[PDB]
Design a protein around this ligand. Structure first.
Ligand SMILES: *[C@@H]1O[C@H](CO)[C@@H](O)[C@H](O)[C@H]1NC(C)=O
Lengths: 102, 51
């Protein structure tokens, strides 16, 4: 979420130097209201681009009043990305990022 | 075409350097049947075909 008053355009890199392949499970938060987008991610509309040297995935969050499931009108879209040995992971996001811990 | 259209919007992100470049190109294909017509509509970022 936002820190104080600014959500920076994160641009991290995670190289795969291991001898085995890695699977990264990451998500994208979809707010229910336009206020929820800014009071949590500041920017008017987020963008998650988890890319590698072979495949990229650019996701744009949706802001709609969805049916109340588990007491919430907002959802989270879970995605995946496989990083082969030698490939590098590049997560580029300016908001609405459910980053993977590992 | 008169049977199928393909609208593509380019992405502007800092991708890893592959062969010394951070930009890529997405190639698609379209088949035009006899009688069908090919209509290419672009205002930028077009890799036009020769034939
Ligand atoms: C993102 O980080 C990588 C590695 O740290 C760097 O090569 C690249 O230039 C950065 N891109 C931006 C837009 O900061």
């Amino acid at each position: 979420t936002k820190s104080g008053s600014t959500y920076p355009v994160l641009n991290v890199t995670m190289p795969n130097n291991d001898n085995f392949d890695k699977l990264y499970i990451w998500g994208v938060h979809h707010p229910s209201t336009n206020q929820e987008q800014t009071s949590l991610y500041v920017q008017a509309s987020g963008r998650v681009t988890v890319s590698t040297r072979r495949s990229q995935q650019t996701i744009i969050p949706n802001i709609e009043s969805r049916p109340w499931v588990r007491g919430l009108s907002s959802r989270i879209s879970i995605y995946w990305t496989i990083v082969k040995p030698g490939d590098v992971l590049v997560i580029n996001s300016n908001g609405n990022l459910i980053a993977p811990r590992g």
